[PDB]
Amino acid sequence: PYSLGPKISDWDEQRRDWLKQNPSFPNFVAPNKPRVLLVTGSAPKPCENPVGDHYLLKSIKNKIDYCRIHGIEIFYNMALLDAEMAGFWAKLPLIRKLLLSHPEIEFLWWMDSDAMFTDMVFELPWERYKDYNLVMHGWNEMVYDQKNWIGLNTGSFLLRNSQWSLDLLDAWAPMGPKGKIREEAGKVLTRELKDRPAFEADDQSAMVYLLATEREKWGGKVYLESGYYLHGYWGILVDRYEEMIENHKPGFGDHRWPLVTHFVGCKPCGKFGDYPVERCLRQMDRAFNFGDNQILQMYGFTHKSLGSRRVKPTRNQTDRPLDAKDEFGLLHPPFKA
């Protein structure tokens, strides 16, 4: 029987004592700002199609820029800690190890390599989650009522460092072990969940199943967020970037300017995906430039067009660089107190 590790039951007590002992590493970097670690990664070998690595590179730069502006540290995993938890399941052993290794972390923010920040201004409403331990983009009706396999998304979520999360991780991993375990589990998920195709068990479907069947146990501390695009399905967003630039401005994080554009199904690192490769890559270029225009804007540049690698100035240079106006206050934001 697979296990993520030796059972721990007093983790909240171990954290409490550790923080008391090490006040130089508080779990809240500011009155209402918890210490956050964004976690991502990818397989340690080159992508089967070579350009896949290039889009992982653009992806990590994108996360670097957002995290530098919002004062959150990054960890990029390139190792498989548990041979039985490969693929999308590999983030469960990783998350557990980082939680136990960094008790100063209050929230762990996992983000897929195919997800990209498209709103550089938007800051997460931390106080909205002060009484919850797991935050995912989704809808209650889709998860608990319809049991729809896309009622939530596990490519961008927050997990609080607590005993509740360690147990949640244990209740989530059983369908992960590669082979017959994961295959037979997929048959269950396709049968019990709505609209789910037939394939091996994935971490997202397992979360829906767990929450739909054990709501009394977990639902109280799970926050299904649908007010902003903590996760944003690319298939309905990338085409509207021009409309967003024309009518709106960064900071909304929702349908007016999504926080995250997640390219579910594109698989730029594998050989085939669920969508045309041409559309996937061209729209990944557009999403990257959509977010990168907000970075270059601080420095007086912008991409010639949303699909061009080339940039152009947005204003003449000056011998008085400190008088310029930072439109969205990202050069010296309050997130870097």
Ligand X SMILES: OC[C@H]1O[C@@H](O[C@H]2[C@H](O)[C@@H](O)[C@H](O[C@H]3[C@H](O)[C@@H](O)[C@H](O[C@H]4[C@H](O)[C@@H](O)[C@H](O[C@H]5[C@H](O)[C@@H](O)[C@H](O[C@H]6[C@H](O)[C@@H](O)[C@H](O)O[C@@H]6CO)O[C@@H]5CO)O[C@@H]4CO)O[C@@H]3CO)O[C@@H]2CO)[C@H](O)[C@@H](O)[C@@H]1O
Ligand Y SMILES: O=c1ccn([C@@H]2O[C@H](COP(=O)(O)OP(=O)(O)O)[C@@H](O)[C@H]2O)c(=O)[nH]1
| Dist. CA 219–CA 134, nearest whole Å | 9
267 annotated among ligand-binding-site residues: yes
| Dist. CA 158–CA 134, nearest whole Å | 6
- Of residues 266 through 325, those in contact with ligand Y by CB under 6 A are 267
> Three-state SS for 321?
helix
**15 or 303, CB closer to ligand Y?**
303
Q: Under the phi-then-psi rule, with left for phi > 0, alpha for psi from -120 to 50, and beta for the rest, what region is 34?
A: beta
> Contacts with ligand X: how many residues (CB under 6 A)?
13
Rg (CA), the chain: 21
* Tokens coding 188: 């269950």
203 near Mn ion (CB under 5 A): no
Residue 34 contacts residue 159 (beta carbons within 8 Å) = no
**229 or 263, CB closer to a copy of itself?**
263
Residue 157 contacts residue 169 (beta carbons within 8 Å) = no
**18 or 199, CB closer to ligand X?**
199
274 annotated among ligand-binding-site residues: yes
33 annotated among ligand-binding-site residues: no
- Beta-ladder partners of 108: 37, 159
Taking CB within 5 to 8 Å according to partner kind, which of a copy of itself, Mn ion, ligand X, none is near residue 279?
none
Nearest to 148 by CA among 190, 187, 89, 203: 190
Question: Shortest approach of ligand Y to residue 281 CB, angstroms?
Answer: 14
65 annotated among ligand-binding-site residues: no
- Of residues 167 through 226, those in contact with ligand X by CB under 6 A are 197, 199-200, 204
114 annotated among ligand-binding-site residues: yes
Binding site for ligand X (CB under 6 A): 139, 142, 150, 153, 197, 199-200, 204, 233, 264-265, 272, 274
- Please give the annotated binding residues, written as ranges: 41, 112-114, 231, 262, 265, 267, 274-275
Contact positions toward ligand Y, by CB under 6 A? 40-43, 77, 87-88, 90-91, 112-114, 155, 264-265, 267
